[PDB]
């Protein structure tokens, strides 16, 4: 196999407690020439967890930060980061199938459960993500008294939650105090799961492009390229894939997507090109398709698989609605009024984003017509977002049922 990322660690917590700084500090050195995704504004940053041969400590660096000797490759992982309390919330509920663990960054200099910190623990709780590590950050700002008081708070906050058995590591994302302990804990907690590679392949296309540029060579200059997260099985150079919703056609009915098929020419994972790609990190598939079809991220939201073995495409959707008890916001925004027949909601499933029209009401279940077909497996969770002014606020989530 490859030395590509083996697991996805979501970086969650208050937008300011330090998640963003810690990610950059750990990933900066494995950067080549993040995002906002197009559907979800999620970003993927890889980082090679290494062990210093001489002093025995862990880091995310080639050369031991301390003694200075060469460190050894132990594993490669990929953190999922995203400025924006909501966007991360959305991505989690929607694509919970992407994370394998999460690092909850809580600032020690602030009362423990901040309105935003609760929502995350809330989302992690809803998607059953139990492989969590807690990083009490900014220990360089609270004397040992306040620190122990924060710790206890954190302890009272996590009891009876999925992060009930998560360590609480005091760290300085700014000075890197105990980053060696943290990085090591990612190996202790959050190990690469046992995944059967033989299961049919499924990849959620996060982005689609046209790497072409009047660079002008007419030969075998690349075709359409898709980037996504393999979540099941594996893709291999030379594979014949079937893309999901597909390419639109001309008004027989009004708008119709036909599923298209292509052949994989390349696969990037980890910074290099490989002949086989696996879950963990982002994968760049090279196809024999017309770049004119992937240009501008038009393929974004689609799913890829082996011709025949894929999810069902939908054109309508009934869901098992579960509104959320949110705390971050202003009272108006807060007490969500229930969805109404005829409202136009914002839906997020996998990496697909589409508007839906409520055309039915029941007891904690609703119906919706899709603005754009979305390839999804039933029982999969869908993020439901209502507007509220000029913005789009996450009010709850639904459960795909059959119509």
């Amino acid at each position: 196999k490859t030395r590509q990322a083996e697991v996805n660690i979501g970086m969650v917590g208050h937008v300011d407690h330090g998640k963003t700084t810690l990610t950059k500090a750990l990933t900066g050195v494995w950067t080549d020439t993040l995002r906002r995704g197009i559907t979800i504004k999620i970003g993927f940053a890889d980082a090679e967890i290494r062990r210093c041969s001489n002093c025995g400590r862990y880091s995310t660096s080639p050369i031991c930060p301390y003694c200075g000797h060469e460190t050894e490759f132990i594993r490669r992982v990929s953190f999922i980061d995203s400025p924006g309390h909501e966007a991360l919330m959305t991505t989690m509920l929607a694509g919970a199938s992407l994370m394998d663990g999460a690092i909850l960054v809580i600032a020690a200099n602030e009362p423990c459960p901040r309105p935003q910190t609760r929502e995350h623990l809330m989302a992690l709780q809803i998607i059953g993500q139990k492989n969590i590590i807690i990083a009490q950050n900014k220990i360089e700002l609270v004397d040992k008294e306040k620190a122990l008081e924060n710790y206890r708070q954190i302890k009272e906050f996590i009891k009876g939650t999925v992060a009930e058995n998560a360590p609480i590591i005091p760290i300085s994302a700014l000075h890197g105090a105990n980053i060696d302990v943290l990085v090591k804990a990612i190996e202790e907690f959050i190990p690469t799961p046992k995944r059967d590679s033989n299961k049919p392949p499924k990849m959620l296309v996060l982005r689609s492009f046209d790497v072409n540029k009047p660079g002008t060579p007419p030969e075998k200059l690349v075709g359409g390229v898709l980037d996504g997260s393999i979540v099941q099985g594996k893709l291999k150079v030379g594979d014949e894939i079937e893309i999901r919703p597909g390419v639109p056609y001309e008004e027989h009915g009004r708008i119709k997507y036909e599923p298209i098929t292509t052949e994989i020419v390349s696969l990037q994972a980890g910074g290099q090109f490989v002949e086989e790609a696996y879950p963990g990190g982002l994968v760049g598939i090279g196809t024999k398709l017309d770049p004119y079809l992937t240009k501008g991220d038009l393929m974004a939201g689609n799913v890829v698989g082996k011709p025949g073995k894929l999810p069902p495409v939908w054109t309508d959707l009934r869901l098992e609605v579960h509104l959320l008890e949110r705390v971050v916001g202003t009272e108006q925004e807060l007490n969500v009024e229930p969805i109404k027949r005829k409202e136009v909601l914002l839906l997020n499933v996998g990496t697909a984003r589409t508007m839906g029209l409520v055309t039915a009401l029941g007891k904690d279940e609703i119906e919706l017509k899709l603005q754009i077909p979305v390839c999804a497996e039933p029982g999969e969770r869908v993020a439901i977002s209502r507007q509220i002014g000029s913005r789009w606020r996450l009010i709850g989530y639904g459960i795909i049922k059959e119509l």
Partner: protein
């Protein structure tokens, strides 16, 4: 040390904490490392702030660095170009040492040490206590 013993994790979480902030005598104005690893070069563009906060020279630090590290950098309009890839913490770890052996008085802790030259020998030192440690280490 197990991750479940927060206490030990806390003291170990303060000893890496710089001098100026760690203990009693706190020069406290040292703002942390800002690192940008572009292409195949590391650049700490907050450099001047560090040096000017430490009241040490600009090039007296570029050096302590390329020494503890093995790359080459040049200084410019308050920034610094390093020739390889270096995580913010690798650099964050060296600046920590500098402050320890080139900016503080080991007898009476004081950001007020200053570099003196009394013979071809560099002895730099405290304006508060008067200790004149030989610093070339």
């Amino acid at each position: 040390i197990d991750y479940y013993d927060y206490e030990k994790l806390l003291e170990k979480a303060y000893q890496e904490l710089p001098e100026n902030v760690k203990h009693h005598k706190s020069r406290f104005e040292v703002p942390g490392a800002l690192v940008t690893i572009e292409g195949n070069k590391t650049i700490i563009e907050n450099f001047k702030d560090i040096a000017d906060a430490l009241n040490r020279d600009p090039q007296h630090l570029l050096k302590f660095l390329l020494r503890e590290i093995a790359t080459a950098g040049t200084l410019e309009g308050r920034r610094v170009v390093l020739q390889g890839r270096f995580t913010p913490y690798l650099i964050a770890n060296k600046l920590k040492k500098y402050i320890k052996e080139y900016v503080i008085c080991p007898v009476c802790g004081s950001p007020d040490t200053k570099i003196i030259k009394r013979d071809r020998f560099h002895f730099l030192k405290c304006e508060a206590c008067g200790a004149e440690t030989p610093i070339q280490h």
